[PDB]
mmCIF file of C-alpha atoms and ligand atoms in Angstrom:
data_model
loop_
_atom_site.group_PDB
_atom_site.id
_atom_site.type_symbol
_atom_site.label_atom_id
_atom_site.label_comp_id
_atom_site.label_asym_id
_atom_site.label_seq_id
_atom_site.Cartn_x
_atom_site.Cartn_y
_atom_site.Cartn_z
ATOM 1 C CA UNK A 7 82.885 4.843 188.376
ATOM 2 C CA UNK A 8 79.681 5.542 190.437
ATOM 3 C CA UNK A 9 80.028 3.526 193.726
ATOM 4 C CA UNK A 10 77.105 5.176 195.663
ATOM 5 C CA UNK A 11 75.049 2.513 197.588
ATOM 6 C CA UNK A 12 71.665 1.700 195.922
ATOM 7 C CA UNK A 13 70.005 -0.305 193.103
ATOM 8 C CA UNK A 14 71.274 -0.235 189.462
ATOM 9 C CA UNK A 15 70.130 -1.516 186.033
ATOM 10 C CA UNK A 16 72.358 -3.926 184.061
ATOM 11 C CA UNK A 17 72.431 -2.738 180.410
ATOM 12 C CA UNK A 18 74.086 -4.111 177.211
ATOM 13 C CA UNK A 19 74.399 -2.413 173.741
ATOM 14 C CA UNK A 20 75.543 -5.708 172.067
ATOM 15 C CA UNK A 21 71.901 -6.167 170.828
ATOM 16 C CA UNK A 22 69.320 -3.821 169.144
ATOM 17 C CA UNK A 23 69.267 -0.411 170.978
ATOM 18 C CA UNK A 24 70.145 -0.498 174.738
ATOM 19 C CA UNK A 25 68.660 -3.619 176.501
ATOM 20 C CA UNK A 26 68.172 -4.063 180.307
ATOM 21 C CA UNK A 27 69.368 -7.669 181.079
ATOM 22 C CA UNK A 28 69.075 -7.371 184.893
ATOM 23 C CA UNK A 29 69.422 -5.344 188.148
ATOM 24 C CA UNK A 30 71.847 -5.322 191.115
ATOM 25 C CA UNK A 31 72.697 -3.800 194.522
ATOM 26 C CA UNK A 32 75.720 -1.657 195.434
ATOM 27 C CA UNK A 33 76.660 -1.852 199.130
ATOM 28 C CA UNK A 34 80.012 -1.255 200.881
ATOM 29 C CA UNK A 35 81.803 -0.787 197.485
ATOM 30 C CA UNK A 36 80.581 -4.234 196.192
ATOM 31 C CA UNK A 37 78.013 -4.810 193.392
ATOM 32 C CA UNK A 38 75.658 -7.830 193.876
ATOM 33 C CA UNK A 39 73.597 -9.470 191.110
ATOM 34 C CA UNK A 40 72.537 -12.942 189.831
ATOM 35 C CA UNK A 41 75.011 -15.108 187.797
ATOM 36 C CA UNK A 42 72.534 -15.666 184.854
ATOM 37 C CA UNK A 43 72.446 -11.800 184.319
ATOM 38 C CA UNK A 44 76.211 -11.171 183.643
ATOM 39 C CA UNK A 45 77.456 -14.799 183.143
ATOM 40 C CA UNK A 46 80.485 -13.553 185.171
ATOM 41 C CA UNK A 47 81.411 -10.875 182.535
ATOM 42 C CA UNK A 48 83.121 -7.605 183.630
ATOM 43 C CA UNK A 49 80.892 -4.454 183.803
ATOM 44 C CA UNK A 50 81.453 -0.714 183.138
ATOM 45 C CA UNK A 51 80.458 2.102 185.561
ATOM 46 C CA UNK A 52 80.921 5.110 183.210
ATOM 47 C CA UNK A 53 84.733 4.936 182.729
ATOM 48 C CA UNK A 54 85.322 2.596 185.743
ATOM 49 C CA UNK A 55 85.581 -1.194 185.145
ATOM 50 C CA UNK A 56 83.982 -3.724 187.596
ATOM 51 C CA UNK A 57 85.765 -7.123 187.882
ATOM 52 C CA UNK A 58 84.073 -10.275 189.249
ATOM 53 C CA UNK A 59 85.410 -11.290 192.726
ATOM 54 C CA UNK A 60 83.151 -14.265 193.762
ATOM 55 C CA UNK A 61 80.389 -16.278 192.046
ATOM 56 C CA UNK A 62 78.598 -19.678 192.153
ATOM 57 C CA UNK A 63 76.320 -20.916 189.251
ATOM 58 C CA UNK A 64 74.388 -23.151 191.722
ATOM 59 C CA UNK A 65 73.487 -20.251 194.108
ATOM 60 C CA UNK A 66 73.013 -18.201 190.819
ATOM 61 C CA UNK A 67 74.891 -15.297 192.606
ATOM 62 C CA UNK A 68 78.010 -13.155 191.747
ATOM 63 C CA UNK A 69 79.801 -10.178 193.431
ATOM 64 C CA UNK A 70 82.054 -7.387 191.884
ATOM 65 C CA UNK A 71 85.027 -5.542 193.600
ATOM 66 C CA UNK A 72 84.772 -7.600 196.826
ATOM 67 C CA UNK A 73 83.184 -10.459 198.797
ATOM 68 C CA UNK A 74 79.332 -10.804 199.109
ATOM 69 C CA UNK A 75 78.197 -8.271 201.836
ATOM 70 C CA UNK A 76 74.388 -8.904 202.203
ATOM 71 C CA UNK A 77 73.683 -11.205 205.203
ATOM 72 C CA UNK A 78 70.093 -10.247 206.192
ATOM 73 C CA UNK A 79 67.445 -13.032 206.268
ATOM 74 C CA UNK A 80 63.599 -13.232 206.091
ATOM 75 C CA UNK A 81 62.358 -13.653 209.744
ATOM 76 C CA UNK A 82 59.822 -16.322 208.542
ATOM 77 C CA UNK A 83 56.743 -14.195 209.546
ATOM 78 C CA UNK A 84 56.704 -10.581 208.168
ATOM 79 C CA UNK A 85 55.630 -9.089 204.781
ATOM 80 C CA UNK A 86 58.591 -7.971 202.525
ATOM 81 C CA UNK A 87 59.046 -5.449 199.641
ATOM 82 C CA UNK A 88 60.330 -6.360 196.148
ATOM 83 C CA UNK A 89 62.032 -3.132 194.898
ATOM 84 C CA UNK A 90 61.236 -4.117 191.255
ATOM 85 C CA UNK A 91 63.213 -2.267 188.493
ATOM 86 C CA UNK A 92 61.523 -3.443 185.236
ATOM 87 C CA UNK A 93 63.013 -2.614 181.785
ATOM 88 C CA UNK A 94 62.256 1.008 180.631
ATOM 89 C CA UNK A 95 60.219 1.638 183.843
ATOM 90 C CA UNK A 96 60.887 3.470 187.177
ATOM 91 C CA UNK A 97 61.793 1.642 190.442
ATOM 92 C CA UNK A 98 58.620 0.571 192.330
ATOM 93 C CA UNK A 99 58.156 -1.195 195.755
ATOM 94 C CA UNK A 100 55.608 -4.135 195.892
ATOM 95 C CA UNK A 101 54.713 -5.377 199.425
ATOM 96 C CA UNK A 102 53.977 -9.159 199.813
ATOM 97 C CA UNK A 103 54.095 -12.022 202.377
ATOM 98 C CA UNK A 104 56.528 -14.545 200.869
ATOM 99 C CA UNK A 105 55.679 -18.260 200.298
ATOM 100 C CA UNK A 106 58.086 -21.246 200.801
ATOM 101 C CA UNK A 107 60.293 -23.412 198.548
ATOM 102 C CA UNK A 108 60.558 -26.814 200.364
ATOM 103 C CA UNK A 109 63.796 -28.670 199.276
ATOM 104 C CA UNK A 110 65.686 -31.741 200.657
ATOM 105 C CA UNK A 111 68.344 -29.224 201.939
ATOM 106 C CA UNK A 112 65.861 -26.955 203.818
ATOM 107 C CA UNK A 113 63.211 -24.229 203.320
ATOM 108 C CA UNK A 114 63.667 -20.993 201.247
ATOM 109 C CA UNK A 115 61.468 -17.854 201.177
ATOM 110 C CA UNK A 116 59.652 -17.305 197.865
ATOM 111 C CA UNK A 117 57.742 -14.324 196.319
ATOM 112 C CA UNK A 118 54.784 -14.830 193.896
ATOM 113 C CA UNK A 119 55.244 -11.731 191.617
ATOM 114 C CA UNK A 120 55.664 -12.116 187.797
ATOM 115 C CA UNK A 121 57.949 -9.455 186.178
ATOM 116 C CA UNK A 122 60.051 -9.445 182.961
ATOM 117 C CA UNK A 123 63.325 -11.504 183.021
ATOM 118 C CA UNK A 124 65.217 -8.157 182.823
ATOM 119 C CA UNK A 125 64.000 -7.477 186.417
ATOM 120 C CA UNK A 126 66.359 -10.342 187.681
ATOM 121 C CA UNK A 127 68.646 -9.010 190.496
ATOM 122 C CA UNK A 128 66.049 -6.589 191.929
ATOM 123 C CA UNK A 129 66.429 -6.756 195.737
ATOM 124 C CA UNK A 130 63.846 -7.875 198.348
ATOM 125 C CA UNK A 131 63.763 -5.858 201.649
ATOM 126 C CA UNK A 132 62.694 -6.215 205.307
ATOM 127 C CA UNK A 133 60.912 -3.411 207.299
ATOM 128 C CA UNK A 134 64.304 -1.910 208.389
ATOM 129 C CA UNK A 135 65.302 -1.539 204.628
ATOM 130 C CA UNK A 136 68.020 -4.329 204.686
ATOM 131 C CA UNK A 137 68.298 -6.585 201.557
ATOM 132 C CA UNK A 138 67.183 -10.160 202.487
ATOM 133 C CA UNK A 139 67.945 -11.444 198.937
ATOM 134 C CA UNK A 140 67.578 -11.018 195.145
ATOM 135 C CA UNK A 141 64.640 -11.727 192.799
ATOM 136 C CA UNK A 142 65.082 -13.631 189.502
ATOM 137 C CA UNK A 143 65.692 -17.409 190.110
ATOM 138 C CA UNK A 144 62.503 -19.509 190.456
ATOM 139 C CA UNK A 145 59.888 -21.754 188.764
ATOM 140 C CA UNK A 146 56.670 -21.698 186.597
ATOM 141 C CA UNK A 147 53.663 -23.298 188.454
ATOM 142 C CA UNK A 148 50.543 -25.292 187.245
ATOM 143 C CA UNK A 149 48.872 -21.897 186.322
ATOM 144 C CA UNK A 150 51.652 -20.513 184.049
ATOM 145 C CA UNK A 151 52.639 -17.775 186.609
ATOM 146 C CA UNK A 152 56.250 -17.270 187.912
ATOM 147 C CA UNK A 153 57.449 -17.576 191.570
ATOM 148 C CA UNK A 154 61.027 -16.276 192.362
ATOM 149 C CA UNK A 155 63.107 -17.551 195.274
ATOM 150 C CA UNK A 156 64.421 -15.145 197.866
ATOM 151 C CA UNK A 157 68.148 -15.922 196.968
ATOM 152 C CA UNK A 158 70.672 -14.785 199.681
ATOM 153 C CA UNK A 159 74.495 -15.216 199.766
ATOM 154 C CA UNK A 160 76.781 -15.825 202.798
ATOM 155 C CA UNK A 161 78.884 -12.929 204.240
ATOM 156 C CA UNK A 162 82.424 -14.251 205.119
ATOM 157 C CA UNK B 7 79.767 -5.277 176.909
ATOM 158 C CA UNK B 8 77.563 -4.542 179.975
ATOM 159 C CA UNK B 9 77.242 -1.263 181.973
ATOM 160 C CA UNK B 10 75.299 -0.172 185.147
ATOM 161 C CA UNK B 11 73.061 2.978 185.705
ATOM 162 C CA UNK B 12 71.684 3.994 189.168
ATOM 163 C CA UNK B 13 67.844 3.454 189.517
ATOM 164 C CA UNK B 14 67.110 4.465 193.186
ATOM 165 C CA UNK B 15 67.905 4.200 196.907
ATOM 166 C CA UNK B 16 66.971 0.983 198.832
ATOM 167 C CA UNK B 17 64.200 2.108 201.291
ATOM 168 C CA UNK B 18 60.974 0.540 202.680
ATOM 169 C CA UNK B 19 58.044 2.651 201.287
ATOM 170 C CA UNK B 20 54.970 2.760 203.649
ATOM 171 C CA UNK B 21 51.634 2.374 201.739
ATOM 172 C CA UNK B 22 53.242 0.597 198.769
ATOM 173 C CA UNK B 23 50.860 -1.609 196.682
ATOM 174 C CA UNK B 24 50.247 -4.858 198.756
ATOM 175 C CA UNK B 25 49.727 -7.928 196.469
ATOM 176 C CA UNK B 26 50.617 -11.555 195.516
ATOM 177 C CA UNK B 27 49.896 -14.784 197.475
ATOM 178 C CA UNK B 28 52.123 -17.110 199.656
ATOM 179 C CA UNK B 29 52.391 -20.615 198.031
ATOM 180 C CA UNK B 30 54.178 -23.600 199.771
ATOM 181 C CA UNK B 31 56.023 -25.486 196.949
ATOM 182 C CA UNK B 32 58.031 -28.774 196.843
ATOM 183 C CA UNK B 33 61.032 -27.965 194.573
ATOM 184 C CA UNK B 34 64.442 -29.444 193.625
ATOM 185 C CA UNK B 35 67.628 -27.539 192.707
ATOM 186 C CA UNK B 36 69.965 -29.098 190.062
ATOM 187 C CA UNK B 37 73.722 -28.413 189.587
ATOM 188 C CA UNK B 38 72.956 -25.724 186.909
ATOM 189 C CA UNK B 39 71.115 -23.682 189.663
ATOM 190 C CA UNK B 40 67.649 -24.317 188.009
ATOM 191 C CA UNK B 41 64.700 -25.013 190.403
ATOM 192 C CA UNK B 42 61.999 -27.574 189.418
ATOM 193 C CA UNK B 43 58.600 -28.695 190.871
ATOM 194 C CA UNK B 44 58.752 -32.049 192.728
ATOM 195 C CA UNK B 45 55.340 -33.822 192.417
HETATM 196 C C1 LIG C 201 60.617 -18.338 182.505
HETATM 197 C C2 LIG C 201 60.823 -17.093 183.313
HETATM 198 C C3 LIG C 201 59.806 -16.120 183.373
HETATM 199 C C4 LIG C 201 59.991 -14.977 184.098
HETATM 200 C C5 LIG C 201 58.918 -13.919 184.188
HETATM 201 O O1 LIG C 201 57.693 -14.283 183.559
HETATM 202 C C6 LIG C 201 61.233 -14.797 184.781
HETATM 203 C C7 LIG C 201 61.525 -13.651 185.564
HETATM 204 C C8 LIG C 201 62.723 -13.529 186.199
HETATM 205 C C9 LIG C 201 63.699 -14.530 186.089
HETATM 206 C C10 LIG C 201 63.471 -15.656 185.333
HETATM 207 N N1 LIG C 201 64.396 -16.704 185.215
HETATM 208 C C11 LIG C 201 64.651 -17.620 186.180
HETATM 209 O O2 LIG C 201 63.817 -17.957 187.018
HETATM 210 C C12 LIG C 201 66.055 -18.167 186.245
HETATM 211 C C13 LIG C 201 66.228 -19.657 185.889
HETATM 212 C C14 LIG C 201 67.627 -19.288 185.384
HETATM 213 N N2 LIG C 201 68.736 -19.440 186.304
HETATM 214 C C15 LIG C 201 67.073 -17.884 185.125
HETATM 215 C C16 LIG C 201 62.213 -15.821 184.666
HETATM 216 N N3 LIG C 201 61.986 -16.949 183.931
#
């Protein structure tokens, strides 16, 4: 299959036409996405098969072909870019200064950008181009608007 | 049965559209990995 580093769409044919269910990142031979996208199902890369290697429903993360590789973190100060990949639409950077999720277990970066559910797994970048986490797990606020977490795994 | 198609490189793009706010939110995370608003 195609193993070139970069961002990919997650497609199924099981429904009407071809449906984009999410997005992911390929880095160092490993494909990174959110658990609610694939539910831990295997994936096809042309004729290649991708098999789940690690995953945690609580983190809402999953990795294919190897351990989670993305270990970059928001610095707490700088603007970021969401590399959004919406269904049927071209990849598109959106610069933003992230907010904060305050939890009993500590503070998480957050991005206030509403996109379709099928955008889940789109990466968030720092100024040096490194992936600081994935978009697609968050909350609906008083308004009705969506705020994603900046979700990041641990590199072992 | 799910498949992947490439959609771009991962690069910072200077003079991208700058937008969205920066809200500070009290949230909880349950065992199903769903966030909720504490109030
Ligand atoms: C209601 C809603 C809305 C939008 C856009 O309007 C969404 C956009 C991306 C991802 C979503 N899902 C999640 O936050 C997680 C919660 C599960 N683990 C899936 C969205 N949910």
